Enzyme design. Structure first.
Site, PDB file in Angstrom:
ATOM      1  N   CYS A  55      24.290  11.112  34.332  1.00 17.76           N
ATOM      2  CA  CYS A  55      25.536  10.776  35.004  1.00 17.76           C
ATOM      3  C   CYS A  55      25.921   9.329  34.719  1.00 17.76           C
ATOM      4  CB  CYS A  55      25.409  11.000  36.511  1.00 17.76           C
ATOM      5  SG  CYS A  55      24.217   9.896  37.286  1.00 17.76           S
ATOM      6  N   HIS A 188      28.187   2.794  31.433  1.00 16.96           N
ATOM      7  CA  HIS A 188      28.165   1.508  30.745  1.00 16.96           C
ATOM      8  C   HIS A 188      29.482   0.773  30.950  1.00 16.96           C
ATOM      9  CE1 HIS A 188      25.711   4.189  27.797  1.00 16.96           C
ATOM     10  NE2 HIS A 188      24.970   3.857  28.839  1.00 16.96           N
TER      11      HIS A 188
HETATM   12  S1  ICS Z   1      21.472   1.536  26.249  1.00 18.02           S
HETATM   13 FE1  ICS Z   1      21.662   3.761  26.021  1.00 18.02          FE
HETATM   14  S2  ICS Z   1      19.644   7.443  26.230  1.00 18.02           S
HETATM   15 FE2  ICS Z   1      21.984   1.956  24.086  1.00 18.02          FE
HETATM   16  S3  ICS Z   1      21.992   4.960  27.849  1.00 18.02           S
HETATM   17 FE3  ICS Z   1      20.009   5.424  27.085  1.00 18.02          FE
HETATM   18  S4  ICS Z   1      17.566   1.858  26.024  1.00 18.02           S
HETATM   19 FE4  ICS Z   1      18.968   5.902  24.717  1.00 18.02          FE
HETATM   20  S5  ICS Z   1      19.754   5.963  22.598  1.00 18.02           S
HETATM   21 MO1  ICS Z   1      17.591   6.571  26.975  1.00 18.02          MO
HETATM   22  S6  ICS Z   1      22.799   4.100  24.101  1.00 18.02           S
HETATM   23 FE5  ICS Z   1      19.593   2.280  25.219  1.00 18.02          FE
HETATM   24  C1  ICS Z   1      19.782   4.232  25.455  1.00 18.02           C
HETATM   25 FE6  ICS Z   1      20.570   4.153  23.632  1.00 18.02          FE
HETATM   26  S7  ICS Z   1      18.300   4.786  28.350  1.00 18.02           S
HETATM   27 FE7  ICS Z   1      17.984   4.015  26.266  1.00 18.02          FE
HETATM   28  S8  ICS Z   1      16.800   5.456  25.064  1.00 18.02           S
HETATM   29  S9  ICS Z   1      19.971   2.040  23.014  1.00 18.02           S
HETATM   30  S1  CLF Z   2      25.397  12.792  39.567  1.00 14.13           S
HETATM   31 FE1  CLF Z   2      24.327  10.852  39.370  1.00 14.13          FE
HETATM   32  S2  CLF Z   2      22.282  11.429  40.003  1.00 14.13           S
HETATM   33 FE2  CLF Z   2      23.556  13.069  40.793  1.00 14.13          FE
HETATM   34  S3  CLF Z   2      23.923  12.575  43.168  1.00 14.13           S
HETATM   35 FE3  CLF Z   2      25.603  11.882  41.608  1.00 14.13          FE
HETATM   36  S4  CLF Z   2      25.143   9.745  41.202  1.00 14.13           S
HETATM   37 FE4  CLF Z   2      23.272  10.779  41.892  1.00 14.13          FE
HETATM   38 FE5  CLF Z   2      21.639  11.855  43.810  1.00 14.13          FE
HETATM   39  S5  CLF Z   2      21.516  12.070  45.802  1.00 14.13           S
HETATM   40 FE6  CLF Z   2      20.064  14.111  45.218  1.00 14.13          FE
HETATM   41  S6  CLF Z   2      20.324  13.388  42.845  1.00 14.13           S
HETATM   42 FE7  CLF Z   2      22.442  14.269  43.202  1.00 14.13          FE
HETATM   43  S7  CLF Z   2      22.200  15.448  44.961  1.00 14.13           S
HETATM   44 FE8  CLF Z   2      23.207  13.546  45.749  1.00 14.13          FE
END
Ligand code: ICS
Ligand code: CLF
Ligand code: CLF
Ligand SMILES: [Fe+3]
Ligand SMILES: [Fe+3]
Lengths: 473, 522, 522, 472
Positions: A55, A188
């Site tokens: 999310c 982000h």
């Molecule tokens: S922040 Fe992104 S999913 Fe750039 S949300 Fe995710 S520590 Fe991945 S491919 Mo987990 S955009 Fe970093 C990432 Fe890459 S958490 Fe890490 S490995 S380089």
């Molecule tokens: S999409 Fe993301 S992780 Fe989901 S709730 Fe929403 S912010 Fe959180 Fe949280 S507390 Fe347990 S895990 Fe959900 S149902 Fe409510």
């Protein structure tokens, strides 16, 4: 193996979907050929297809803000979100947890029904007072909004402005409710803008910071297993002075000092390009992309960074390359003969699916398929160049598609996340976690490449994979 | 620098001198760090009793909770049914977290879907997502049943699960006979265990409510066993093992034992075993229904007693010596089968172990935490060994439960220094172990940071952790253990006694200092 | 000075100032002790490779052996037979030690008698002791059988056990048909495992040698299982567990499982379970005989092959993945029963645990010791896990065994830095873990003093001990564990990986120093 | 406890024996009245005696605890291995460098040592000990069974190698077949100290003496018992020059001829060398008892009377300082142990020496006995034990079980070969050898531990759980 097979495989897999999902999924699978050209991304997930995506709260709290160590980050809402994400990502930091750092801690408002009916703003102000008596050395507070915050009409910004002015403390409201966006991606962006509107401009009229022509900031390196520390050493051995790391091991003051640097080194484009573009408009600070995966990309990136400065930094850059040359060459000599020709499939988030291919090829490996959870079209544009022809590409892959693709291609190694690791280990396919580095790492820089090569070898060539079938069927 | 002779991972790589100085300049140059002597003085203050008083005034802030949210338990309950997909109506991030949380504890695949409710569903409702989600899941992963729960998003906007599913069948998205039970599992109510109760009670009524006329209690001559939120594989297996030794016909309703422990043989199995739908339809015909963890099955109890007309026995969790006996004696009374000689011997063996180890267990002071049924059985067993449960903490416990545990402590001299806490978290516990130091902690992996804090104060204040609970992330395969029955009592005893002995060995290993007590025979 | 509410045992009582000063004044004024600066220099010398070379040039002195004497194993073999009293012809001081040694490892009663041969018997033989001893034993403890071994006293003066027993029945001290098997078990030959071999060979001779006329191989459709010197209760259980799942008729010859695990139920049972004499007399009618520890059952094999005419298959101890597989397939070929899906799954789950944990096991360097069959299976399993058994020590190992083990090492890249030592002792091993430091030691409780010595040199030189083997004195109930078959492999795997992780946790528990690697998830 | 009951019990236990052993065992069972028992006689064969051997009495008991000496178990591998670290004679030292108590030095006899003798091996062994343990201050050679039967001559080796290295090598002929018990092991060990070590400093005059010099004889520091006693006498003003042999050094023993008084705790194991020092050096010796407060108070004063009035004043200081401590121990634990009956069976001293400690907690000793005590030991036991209490010498396992089945004591104090028998029967059990890995029990500080240990075990909740609630 190539072209008509891979494309016949894609239609092979999709014949099991209802028409609506089939039509949408068809556009997220494609074959490479080195301008959306062949694949869309950053679209809604089809319901009930076991997506790997998280999310927007994950993208803001667990990714951008969490790693900031001297700040307290509150999971505003029920108790689930902050708990499942407590210490889930290995964004490392130096500090005294519970005193002056708080990364692996879980602060929450823990919503009860009384707060869904009445709103949770009065509690949030009361929470901020309790935080201040119990953690006096925190240098800032962030309020990460969970799903119910937006749906009940709460205003965390007014609480932040009132309590912030009262306690003379930076309090960052972040509206990263999980239902916003399609994935971690918007998290982000929401987080970047929250850095902008509440933190980044605090020292714009302050002039006490003594700058230098070699001041530099690392953007998009979250220090997974010390990744940012393996990168910093190389840059400061080159003569540069790194004023900040966003957000791995980062501090609130390092963020506020970033507008004083001369160059912004962006590792993760997908998660940090937003604040980079704003810092070039507001402060005129240019930003470039780089890659510290493997010796090839690291040497290429080191020289590209040195070119932005004078001949001294360029002459140190070649002294650094020469000093680590015997090291990474010994690494390649020892491990390439054991990994040459092995085919790897990848599925990660928004950067690594393309940024590590150079490291694999330095060990003589071949990426026959990669893909992103939440990348955008400009991420796939950079990916086209980094991978060969007739290779598989998938966006927001489903659990079923991924399993089906691995069965036909039979890759020698898979690199993905925890929700896929145990699926393919039972299928007899060696697996490395490319998020947490399988609790190993770091993988950045030259020192990281040694670990990387050791880690790919120990798993691919582990004896356990020979014993999957019983010697009696 | 790396020697290809001996590659170094993060530890101890960043202890090399060149990394050490760099992090020092990073700190001194750009971190605006507080002086170390301030950090020490503050840390000391956080271990004091004045801080504890402030710590226990908190009304709004929760630090390091010891509980999860409802749908987590609803997923686990659903995985225990034959070829069913747990389906969480709401936002997808929850499901990504639910699977991750369980992946890390069980080190196994955990299949669970969402219908990815987004920005639009928050204003128009998630009825369309439910329609295509049910149709997509059923065709893609071919389950025989789909158990629906909710995220807190779907609960706030007030989506009616019953209508949304019915209108999915009316319009032909799923067949009209395809089983789709459901439960509202709001994350802002109770905890993960409530999600287990809500899901199971919802699955029960789906197969039982509109069919009671043909049911007569006892005609299948079996006993229903509802395990509750259970994350030790041995606990499911020890219940079935003892019931088979007694020759008792049973139905373990919600049995995720197979799917959480499929073999690695070159093939992935999304589904494995579990309670079939046929057992769920026949469950009203049982002699009675036993609740292994009644303190978070109250909704299910009221349904079983009210609709099935089963006289649910008042039984504590079968943890420890006395409660395993009362459990076996109740099962014997209901089924008419006598307790076999194999269980009599096994009980005696557990007793023999207590006699051989009572000298090292006597007087040891334990802090502990976890879920309500697990905590009170561990408290009971500790008293049976002559230990002192000094700090007892259950974040998701209610006051009726606290009075039940307070009476258990009052009925024993070893509960005299014992206090039970409700609604408190591990940050509260971190203060209790500083100001009223126990000898050990018994809890999940989150307690590892409390032990790290005690050691920072000094070696003589370190309180080691004994990993018994959920989740356990920093060890491997402890989820295979057992905590129920005599077998579970023997493993816990073994874990307790030997943790005590390993600590003594560590404290008395100083050559020509403390090794005078480094005995070979203990 | 004792505080009534906080009474201190020896540790930490003698840390008080008045004790520390009094011990310091005792030393300085009366002990004439070497100066600490000298003994520090000497200790450092004893960790050098120069000292190791002097250490390994020994040939007359043995320091901290890793073996016992024959009769110890003869007693344990005898305890495995129904209502059998172990009886060792010689001096009584040995039985005091044999029983004490086993008491402390099993924490159970260990019944064994002597005929108390004294100075008079040394110069005239012990015949009279045998006559009164057997008669006193049979009337007092009412055993069905008395199994006679010898102390080293009786072996030196040349007592003829066969004659002494026959004379005891000739003169009516014990009935003529009363079973009295015997074996010579000289302590200056082999070790305790050889005493097990001699005792079992003698008992098999007594019940079969004269009755071969009417024995046809395979008539009872069973397989004979000889466990050898075995001190884990789970190892007897797991073998009979898998054979029961395969539907294979089996006869476990020598089964002390019941006698060494009697329940505490208000009464003491001297005898319990065990192999009946009927099974021993009918053993030659089995399809074949399997030796679980063939490297100390040489004599038993010669008799089984020479007199029963069984083709004892060439099987290694069923330890680890590959050897448990070969063991089941051999039992399947002999018995005609297929390997059931229950064992096919259990193997799969072991493999799943290997894949789950391999990243922490890979490359880990172990020193280990124990008995030959146990050691070779541990080395085998370690290689399958990707670990490197650097130092392999078997004090009572022979030369052809070393060649067999060296062949297993050469067939795997993970044995490239391994060396097998025979005839060396745990003072030789102390040097090896100083000069070629491994990461952990796998051995018995005597290894705790090697960990104590490594820690004295420095914390980065400490080699933690992982307690697998015999005897285990400073931990409780580990004798209940399992090391055979898939179940045993799963316990060994869990023990190893979690030993690595708790050491990593300890090294990365330093706040603001190394705790950056104090990960919650591993 | 009727006394025709105990006499009729002793009777209808021995009906299982054959006549030869019944007649000899009848003389080893008696009920007393504060000349009716015999002891230190051969064990009847095949009746599962708890006794050890003379090697245990010498190596494992007297010599082993001496920490700066290296004790060689001369013979096959068994004896030294089963006794390695078996009893908790605590010491201060650096094991493997300057101390060697818990280590196992052996000659590991093979077949070629049995046929050819092991004296060439013993001489090469002593060399290997000298190269690999240079800080050892003496070597003792403890003979196991085969040494004396194959005609070996360890003394000629000890005298030759002793002069060659200018080091004291003590040949001890404690073969397990000699004697009937560990008792003769003591004597052989005492005579070996007397003849090879004790006279070392008959010529020396450099040790500055003191009118208050003393030495403790026969306290082997089980769990620190000697340290917990030495503290009490040094606070009284006396000077303890030596501890034999618990945490004892060769230098301490060598200086024992220079004391003014020898305080013997264990008479049975150390009376031999005690009389010899009174004959050769005129040093008087006296018995005492540091078990429980009553016997410790009584002993401290009796010891003080052998000196001037300074010590007798320092004495009463000691008694008053620990007065609130042990009185708090009683108030806390006596109401938990009062009136409960203890049955004991230990070795040669404690079966009577701990009677006073159990009485200070309100417990009664309905039965006691020794493994290897002599008749003078039982003479002292007559005074300490009450009327019509059962006494047994070298009790058999069968007898010990049948006695407890009828008498039904509340707690049994014995050794490791009996603990798990009576635990399964439902009778609490405390090890009175190893203190069940607790202790110390000597002195005031020990009485606290002793009292806490009897209470945690006797009143442990596990004992009311032996019976299944469905078997009743
Ligand atoms: S922040 Fe992104 S999913 Fe750039 S949300 Fe995710 S520590 Fe991945 S491919 Mo987990 S955009 Fe970093 C990432 Fe890459 S958490 Fe890490 S490995 S380089
Ligand atoms: S999409 Fe993301 S992780 Fe989901 S709730 Fe929403 S912010 Fe959180 Fe949280 S507390 Fe347990 S895990 Fe959900 S149902 Fe409510
Ligand atoms: S009375 Fe004799 S000295 Fe005493 S303890 Fe016995 S041998 Fe030894 Fe025996 S245990 Fe084995 S058989 Fe010999 S070596 Fe040693
Ligand atoms: Fe797994
Ligand atoms: Fe026991």
């Amino acid at each position: 193996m190539s072209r008509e097979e891979v494309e016949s495989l894609i239609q092979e897999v999709l014949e099991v979907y209802p028409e609506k999902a089939r039509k949408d999924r068809n556009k997220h699978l494609a074959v490479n050929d080195p301008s959306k050209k062949c694949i869309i991304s950053n679209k809604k997930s089809q319901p009930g297809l076991m997506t790997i995506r998280g999310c927007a709260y994950a993208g803001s709290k667990g990714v951008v803000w969490g790693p900031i160590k001297d700040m307290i980050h509150i999971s505003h809402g029920p108790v689930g979100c902050g708990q499942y994400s407590r210490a889930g990502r290995r964004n490392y930091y130096i500090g005294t947890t519970g005193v002056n750092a708080f990364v692996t801690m879980n602060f929450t408002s823990d919503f009860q029904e009384k707060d869904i009916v009445f709103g949770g703003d009065k509690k949030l102000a009361k929470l901020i007072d309790e935080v201040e008596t119990l953690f006096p050395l925190n240098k800032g507070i962030s309020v990460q909004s969970e799903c119910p915050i937006g749906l009940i009409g709460d205003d965390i910004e007014s609480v932040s402005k009132v309590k912030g002015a009262e306690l003379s403390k930076t309090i960052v409201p972040v509206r990263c409710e999980g239902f916003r966006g399609v994935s971690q991606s918007l998290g982000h962006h929401i987080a970047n803008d929250a850095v902008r509107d509440w933190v980044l401009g605090k020292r714009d009229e302050d002039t006490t910071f003594a700058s230098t022509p070699y001041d530099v900031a690392i953007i998009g390196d979250y220090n997974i297993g010390g990744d940012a520390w393996s990168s910093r050493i190389l840059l400061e051995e080159m003569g540069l002075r790194c004023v900040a790391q966003w957000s791995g091991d980062g501090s609130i003051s390092e963020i506020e000092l970033t507008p004083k640097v001369k160059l912004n080194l962006v590792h993760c484009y997908r998660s940090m390009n937003y604040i980079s573009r704003h810092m070039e408009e507001k402060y005129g600070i240019p930003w470039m992309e780089y890659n510290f995966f493997g010796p090839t990309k690291t040497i290429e990136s080191l020289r590209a960074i040195a070119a932005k400065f004078d001949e001294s930094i360029q002459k140190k850059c070649e002294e650094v390359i020469a000093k680590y040359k015997p090291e990474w060459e010994a690494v390649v000599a020892k491990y390439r003969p054991r990994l040459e020709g092995k085919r790897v499939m990848l599925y990660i988030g928004g950067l690594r699916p393309r940024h590590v291919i150079g490291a694999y090829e330095d060990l003589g490996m071949e990426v026959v398929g990669t893909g992103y959870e939440f990348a955008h079209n400009d991420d796939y544009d950079r990916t086209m160049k980094e991978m060969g022809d007739s290779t598989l590409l998938y966006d927001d892959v489903t659990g079923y598609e991924f399993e089906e693709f691995v069965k036909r291609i039979k890759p020698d190694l898979i690199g993905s996340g925890i929700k896929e690791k145990f699926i393919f280990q039972k299928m007899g396919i060696p697996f490395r976690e490319m998020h947490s580095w399988d609790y190993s790492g770091p993988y950045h820089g030259f020192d990281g490449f040694a670990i990387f090569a050791r880690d790919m070898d120990m798993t691919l060539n582990n004896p356990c994979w020979k014993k999957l079938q019983a010697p009696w069927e | 620098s790396q020697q290809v002779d001996k590659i170094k991972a993060s530890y101890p790589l960043f202890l090399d001198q060149d990394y050490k100085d760099m992090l020092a300049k990073k700190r001194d140059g750009f971190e605006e760090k507080y002086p170390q002597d301030k950090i020490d003085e503050v840390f000391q203050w956080t271990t004091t009793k004045e801080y504890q008083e402030l710590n226990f005034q908190r009304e709004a802030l929760t630090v390091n909770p010891a509980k999860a949210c409802q749908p987590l338990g609803a997923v686990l309950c659903a995985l225990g049914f034959e070829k069913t997909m747990p389906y969480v109506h709401g936002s997808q991030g929850c499901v990504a977290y639910f699977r991750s949380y369980f992946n890390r504890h069980f080190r196994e695949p955990v299949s669970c879907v969402s219908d990815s409710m987004t920005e639009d569903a928050a204003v128009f409702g998630g009825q369309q997502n439910m329609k295509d989600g049910l149709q997509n899941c059923k065709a893609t992963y071919k389950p025989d049943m789909i158990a629906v729960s909710t995220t807190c998003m779907a609960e706030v906007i007030g989506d009616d699960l019953n209508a949304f599913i019915n209108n999915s069948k009316k319009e032909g998205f799923i067949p009209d006979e395809f089983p789709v039970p459901f439960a509202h599992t709001p994350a802002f109510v109770g905890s993960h265990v409530t999600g287990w109760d809500n899901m199971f009670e919802g699955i029960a009524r789906y197969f039982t409510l509109k069919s009671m006329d043909d049911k007569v209690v006892g005609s299948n001559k079996k006993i229903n066993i509802v395990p509750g939120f259970e994350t030790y594989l041995g606990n499911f297996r020890v219940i079935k093992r003892m019931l088979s030794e007694m020759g008792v016909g049973y139905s373990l309703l919600s049995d995720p034992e197979e799917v959480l422990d499929t073999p690695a043989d070159g093939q992935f199995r999304m589904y494995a075993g579990g309670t079939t739908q046929e057992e769920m339809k026949d469950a009203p015909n049982a002699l009675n229904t036993v609740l292994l963890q009644p303190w978070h099955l109250e909704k299910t109890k009221k349904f079983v007693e009210g609709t099935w007309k089963h006289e649910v026995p008042k039984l504590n969790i079968p943890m420890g010596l006395d409660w395993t006996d009362e459990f076996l004696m109740k099962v014997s009374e209901i089924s008419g089968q006598p307790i076999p000689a194999s269980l009599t011997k096994e009980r005696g063996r557990l007793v023999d172990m207590m006699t051989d180890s009572h000298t090292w267990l006597h007087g040891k002071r334990f802090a502990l935490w976890g879920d309500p049924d697990f905590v009170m059985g561990l408290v009971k067993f500790l008293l049976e060994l002559g230990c002192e449960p000094v700090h007892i903490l259950c974040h998701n416990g209610n006051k009726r439960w606290k009075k039940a545990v307070d009476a258990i402590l009052a009925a024993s001299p070893y509960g005299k220094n014992a206090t039970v806490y409700i609604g408190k978290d591990l940050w509260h516990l971190r203060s209790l172990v500083f100001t009223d130091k126990p000898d050990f902690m018994i809890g999940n992996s989150y307690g590892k940071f409390i032990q790290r804090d005690t050691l920072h104060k000094g070696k003589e204040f370190e309180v080691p952790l004994i990993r018994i609970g959920f989740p356990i992330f920093d060890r491997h395969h402890l989820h295979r253990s057992t905590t129920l029955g005599y077998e579970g009592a023997m493993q816990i005893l073994t874990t307790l006694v030997n943790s005590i002995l390993e600590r003594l060995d560590e404290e008395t290993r100083g050559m020509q200092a403390t090794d005078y007590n480094h005995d070979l025979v203990r």
